[PDB]
């Protein structure tokens, strides 16, 4: 049975941005999606985000898919590095993903300090994609393209996407639903 988990970033929760839209759009296809909240989204700590993800660890299988936004991206990358898996998850989609310090949000450096084991991430997710906005002023586009290269992920550029936030109009995001769905047909 397919399962999609949706993981938010800094200063967000399950009710923000495009997450409710994506959950409901998936439900229209009979696909179960759960938006996960992380602890202390205003002062996030990597170890606590990883401990929360670990609450779900026993449910992760070959038909599980993880969709993350912004800070949720390096969090799930760190999670997969330390996960013992019998087989790869179905896939990951990293919206505005990054794996190094964000100059305008250095308070979040602990989530990306240190190199990542790229091979383990590649082996942990059958299908991989990064969706990124060319005019993102929080996560520079180049950082998302860099990450896509490091983890051999398909990169989808949106020329004018801001940072895919509700205050920029992104209470929906069809590209994420369509990229995800293409994984299911494969």
From Swiss-Prot:
Organism superkingdom: Bacteria
Residues annotated as the enzyme's active site: 70 (charge relay system), 136 (charge relay system), 163 (charge relay system)
Listed EC numbers: 3.-.-.-
Record-level Gene Ontology MF annotations: hydrolase activity
Alphabetic keyword roster: Hydrolase
Membership in a protein family: Belongs to the RBBP9 family.
PANTHER family xref list: SERINE HYDROLASE RBBP9
Name used for this protein in its record: Putative hydrolase YdeN
Annotated source species: Bacillus subtilis (strain 168)
């Amino acid at each position: 049975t397919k399962q999609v988990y949706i993981i938010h970033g800094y200063r967000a929760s399950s009710t923000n941005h495009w997450f409710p839209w994506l959950k409901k759009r998936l439900l229209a296809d009979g696909v179960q999606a759960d938006i996960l909240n992380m602890p202390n989204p205003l002062q996030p700590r990597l170890e606590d985000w990883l401990d929360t993800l670990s609450l779900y660890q026993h449910t992760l299988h070959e038909n599980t898919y993880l969709v993350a936004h912004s800070l949720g991206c390096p969090a799930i990358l760190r999670f997969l590095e330390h996960l013992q898996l019998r087989a790869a998850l179905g896939g990951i989609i990293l919206v505005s993903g990054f794996a190094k310090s964000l100059p305008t949000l250095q308070m979040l450096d602990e989530f990306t300090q240190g190199s990542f084991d790229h091979q383990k991430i590649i082996e942990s997710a059958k299908h991989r994609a990064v969706i990124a906005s060319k005019d993102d002023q929080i996560v520079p586009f180049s950082f998302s393209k860099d990450l896509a290269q490091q983890i051999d992920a398909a990169l989808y550029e949106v020329q004018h996407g801001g940072h895919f936030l509700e205050d920029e109009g992104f209470t929906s995001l069809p590209i994420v639903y369509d990229v995800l769905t293409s994984y299911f047909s494969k």
